[PDB]
Amino acid sequence: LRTLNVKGQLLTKTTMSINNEDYYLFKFLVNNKSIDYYGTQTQFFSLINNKTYELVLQYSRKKLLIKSYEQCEDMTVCKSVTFQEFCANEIKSLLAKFLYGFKIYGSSNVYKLVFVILLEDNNGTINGVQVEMMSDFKRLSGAFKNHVIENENDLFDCMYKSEEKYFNLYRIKCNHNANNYKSLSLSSNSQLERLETDDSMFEYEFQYDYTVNISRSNKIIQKHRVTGNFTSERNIYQNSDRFVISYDTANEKIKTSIYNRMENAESKTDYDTSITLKDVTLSQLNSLIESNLVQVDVYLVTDPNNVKNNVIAGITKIEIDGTYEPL
DNA sequence: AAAAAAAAAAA
Numbered sequence: 001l002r003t004l005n006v007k008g009q010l011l012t013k014t015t016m017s018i019n020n021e022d023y024y025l026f027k028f029l030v031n032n033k034s035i036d037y038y039g040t041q042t043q044f045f046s047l048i049n050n051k052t053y054e055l056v057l058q059y060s061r062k063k064l065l066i067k068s069y070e071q072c073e074d075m076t077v078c079k080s081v082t083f084q085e086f087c088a089n090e091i092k093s094l095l096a097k098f099l100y101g102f103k104i105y106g107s108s109n110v111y112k113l114v115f116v117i118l119l120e121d122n123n124g125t126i127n128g129v130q131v132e133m134m135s136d137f138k139r140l141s142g143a144f145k146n147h148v149i150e151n152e153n154d155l156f157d158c159m160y161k162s163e164e165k166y167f168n169l170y171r172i173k174c175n176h177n178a179n180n181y182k183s184l185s186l187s188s189n190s191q192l193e194r195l196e197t198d199d200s201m202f203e204y205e206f207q208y209d210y211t212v213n214i215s216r217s218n219k220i221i222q223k224h225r226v227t228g229n230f231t232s233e234r235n236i237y238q239n240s241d242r243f244v245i246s247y248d249t250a251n252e253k254i255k256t257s258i259y260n261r262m263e264n265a266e267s268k269t270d271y272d273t274s275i276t277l278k279d280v281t282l283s284q285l286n287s288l289i290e291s292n293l294v295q296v297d298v299y300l301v302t303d304p305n306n307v308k309n310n311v312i313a314g315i316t317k318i319e320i321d322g323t324y325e326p327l
Numbered sequence: 328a329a330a331a332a333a334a335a336a337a338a
Contacts (some may be wrong), residue, residue, distance in 0.1 A: 301332090
């Protein structure tokens, strides 16, 4: 059959079993595009992650296949980013400081990661800003280079031991919505590499101090270790339906809300059951905190000026076994 | 069929 000659960097290898047949597929980075190819078990085992290859491909059974490969060999990340590079929705490689990582409250699959980057005004000044990057479990598992994320506990463990550490963000997409909200996005070929600096880059720590979160409007995200009197009531108002929450961080009493809205494709019975399970699990949280059975972190969308529209972005339970439960 | 921030409610 006809053969295709390509060259590209491997990103991940996956095994999917469907209708009692196993398929080994490799995600390769060719010309800054993620292309999925098929292969055999020898391909699955011999090929290594994050390495370029010279591949020959045969088009068999309506599927591009890998026949032979040659292990070849081959980056620079921008230390900043401009407003216009966010406006154009460009694709960049940044140097960011990881801050927090949590599972969006009430979301089954999506996670949110908080970074500190250097934005640049048209005035030509670089300010360390706080940015949010949402993703799913699959992309987040396949994005951390040199880290094997199998289940959710591994993802949270990587998140917690990557906290306040520097990351090269390869081929991330700089979103910009209709309103002036700028976020980060994780594409198929996007990768996240942890530097393990050992504070080798410390003179720049002054630059990585934030006062504005550019993915939100005059709000930031802050992480609190609940040490005291957690409390959560539920209030169904005429329109809204929110958990009114108070708790006690080592510094401040905090008041907050978790707003509940029914999804379009969500039956009222399923929504009501899910919300009552959320309420039951929140009303048991203070009992677990007091008895030293869990340690709770709350990631909070706080307004630095007026604390009257606080919202809990996420909650994470660290259990005494070491397991992480994303409340 | 965008999605995601912002939303004290209720007189």
